[PDB]
Design a protein around this ligand. Sequence first.
Ligand SMILES: CC(C)(COP(=O)(O)OP(=O)(O)OC[C@H]1O[C@@H](n2cnc3c(N)ncnc32)[C@H](O)[C@@H]1OP(=O)(O)O)[C@@H](O)C(=O)NCCC(=O)NCCSC(=O)c1ccc2ccccc2c1
Ligand SMILES: Cc1cc2nc3c(=O)[nH]c(=O)nc-3n(C[C@H](O)[C@H](O)[C@H](O)COP(=O)(O)OP(=O)(O)OC[C@H]3O[C@@H](n4cnc5c(N)ncnc54)[C@H](O)[C@@H]3O)c2cc1C
Ligand SMILES: Cc1cc2nc3c(=O)[nH]c(=O)nc-3n(C[C@H](O)[C@H](O)[C@H](O)COP(=O)(O)O)c2cc1C
Ligand code: SF4
Length: 660
Amino acid sequence: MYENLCKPIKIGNHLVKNRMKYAATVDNFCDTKNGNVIDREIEYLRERAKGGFGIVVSQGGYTHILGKGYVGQMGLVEESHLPGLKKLADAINAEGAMSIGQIMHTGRYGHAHEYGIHEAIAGGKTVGPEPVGPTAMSSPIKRYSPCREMTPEEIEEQIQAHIVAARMFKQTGWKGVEVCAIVGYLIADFLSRWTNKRTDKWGGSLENRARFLIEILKGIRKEVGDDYPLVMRLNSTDLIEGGNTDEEYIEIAKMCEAAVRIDLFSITVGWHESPGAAITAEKRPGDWLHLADNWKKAGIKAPICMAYRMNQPDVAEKAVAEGRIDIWEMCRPGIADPYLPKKVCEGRPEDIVTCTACNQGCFYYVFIDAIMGCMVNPRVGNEWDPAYAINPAAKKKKVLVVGAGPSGMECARLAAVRGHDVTIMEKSDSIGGEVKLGVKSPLLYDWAETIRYYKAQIDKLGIKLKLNTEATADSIKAEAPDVLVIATGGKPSRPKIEGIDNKIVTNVFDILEGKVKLGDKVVFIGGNEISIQTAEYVAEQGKEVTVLEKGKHICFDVNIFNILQHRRLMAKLNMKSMTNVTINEINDDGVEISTAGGKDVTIEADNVVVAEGMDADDALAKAVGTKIAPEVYSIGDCAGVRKLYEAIHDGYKMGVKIRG
Ligand SMILES: CC(C)(COP(=O)(O)OP(=O)(O)OC[C@H]1O[C@@H](n2cnc3c(N)ncnc32)[C@H](O)[C@@H]1OP(=O)(O)O)[C@@H](O)C(=O)NCCC(=O)NCCSC(=O)c1ccc2ccccc2c1
Ligand SMILES: Cc1cc2nc3c(=O)[nH]c(=O)nc-3n(C[C@H](O)[C@H](O)[C@H](O)COP(=O)(O)OP(=O)(O)OC[C@H]3O[C@@H](n4cnc5c(N)ncnc54)[C@H](O)[C@@H]3O)c2cc1C
Ligand SMILES: Cc1cc2nc3c(=O)[nH]c(=O)nc-3n(C[C@H](O)[C@H](O)[C@H](O)COP(=O)(O)O)c2cc1C
Ligand code: SF4
């Protein structure tokens, strides 16, 4: 089934069992006080190695405190870091994965001041805690603070720190070393003409900008020796106006191959300051592969790997078959499903927990300096935690799950995996709940992969699925289960708006279930994530859509990464939006609003969607109490409206805790 992806490959002298590589992922799982590797990190990475990845990369470790860019970033500076690095290599290696350690000074993106640092020693001098770069400059975005210009002594010290980092990996049993020269971190800062205005030997010509990197590479090669695998990450495109050209990145790669033997090139897209889409759902699998072709035709010797929205095994298999890339590299597909390679090579891709590119538990949580999680994978960061262990149930119980939404389906899946006798009662003709409605939205196409996964799991686990079956107090009593799990989700709210009872008024459920025929002018009251995604579905059908928000911003419940993707799509779809508006009335003609400036205006509509929020659909839970069955639980939105992350996590927590 996946002959090309499951084919072995030599990386330097080391033979890798397949073409699937798990990419570097800073997750804030390391000790925030000192950069030490701890059990949370060991177990996270051990699971990707158990999952069958041929190559497992560590997160990028800072070579100096000023280069620490995440609250729990791994350190590569002191002798005290060596024990944890050994423990991490042993855990990855024992699984038969090639352990590769990554070196990553975050440069201009450093946040030492926020991590309780007020002073440090750099280039033999006491300096402030500000981030460092080849040139003193500011960032076009708030997140990153103005950087200080490194002295040549600081530049020389960093080459030495990179060599030391490489030595630390080799002595602790790591099978290879990866130099992170991407996305706007320190090396990428010296490489790009946008960030490097230096007039000495470290900037100017392309060779001068590449000198820091070449010196780091030459230094590492001399230290680790000729037989040790030395790999690297380099941009194929920075998506920065005034940055380096795509051909320039190829010329840099050729400078690297000419100085040291490079055993693998990981090719990347964008900088964190890039205004364009790189990793969102706007990018489909294979949208970046032409870049790999250009590296191949330029004559790059070393094997090449590429990630960047490559979440589909069929797209990657073809890419490797055609020799476009030698290795399918991935980060978020491996966060979502650490067993993706084991599933690919056993020929069971219907079992894959696909990454939906929601950027919540991964990108968002890490950038807001929180412990990394995952929407579709509740085990992310919890692999080390005994409360998340999946153990067979001693005595089998009759488990009744009410509702085939994501919380109910995750609970049912875990309870059946652990050996319970599980039944799901679903009031509609299909599974998925609000996920089934959401999949109609332009950016939520990968939600069909979530429906596919659960449908295949229910089948395989022998869960008794009862569709078109509304659970009532009497049908529960007839079923007589040992455990009742209520997962009836949420329902659109009905705020106290004048003229809400008007026939022009509809809701998000009616739109997405096809229970309403819409006109040409459609007006949405509410600017939350759900309202926006239903509005985007309506506008994509070539209709005139206006979104009215009483609060200060639209997409107020949307994470920082997805905010941009909605701005781009609402512009492309010619969508109108108004914030700080007072909704006065809904009438036959549309909705009467008063702006914050005091202007009374009529928003003309054929349909008015009242989408201000969701209420818990808890009527069943209130009707039956806590005594209808020996154990009664409410999970997901019916227990209090939250979002998908909390629904899938509630489901998992419920499924693992059902006792025997
Ligand atoms: C989520 C951000 C990281 C930060 O956003 P934030 O809201 O925190 O920005 P800020 O607080 O500074 O406010 C700036 C304003 O501009 C907007 N904005 C922020 N970043 C922007 C941007 N990059 N382009 C255009 N506009 C941007 C933002 O919505 C906001 O609007 P406002 O609320 O009305 O003031 C954002 O810059 C962003 O999504 N950038 C694109 C990320 C990207 O594609 N990177 C390359 C692919 S990922 C990659 O290769 C990589 C490599 C190493 C990594 C290591 C660790 C973690 C991730 C890594 C990823
Ligand atoms: C258009 C849209 C877009 C969204 N976008 C996002 C997003 O981008 N990010 C995010 O985090 N969240 C998003 N959400 C919210 C997210 O989908 C929900 O939070 C999540 O589905 C809640 O899961 P749940 O299992 O608790 O409930 P539900 O998904 O609502 O499932 C409940 C299920 O129970 C069934 N049911 C109800 N009563 C009974 C009964 N008595 N007997 C039997 N079955 C019954 C229903 O038919 C349904 O299948 C979106 C929702 C919608 C509608
Ligand atoms: C939470 C998170 C942390 C990341 N940390 C690193 C890192 O330490 N080093 C690195 O080179 N890339 C890092 N990346 C980038 C990924 O390795 C990957 O190249 C990128 O997310 C695109 O691939 P994908 O679509 O498979 O996720 C990170 C990405 C995420 C989601
Ligand atoms: S949190 Fe969302 S984007 Fe990140 S790995 Fe999980 S499903 Fe993918």
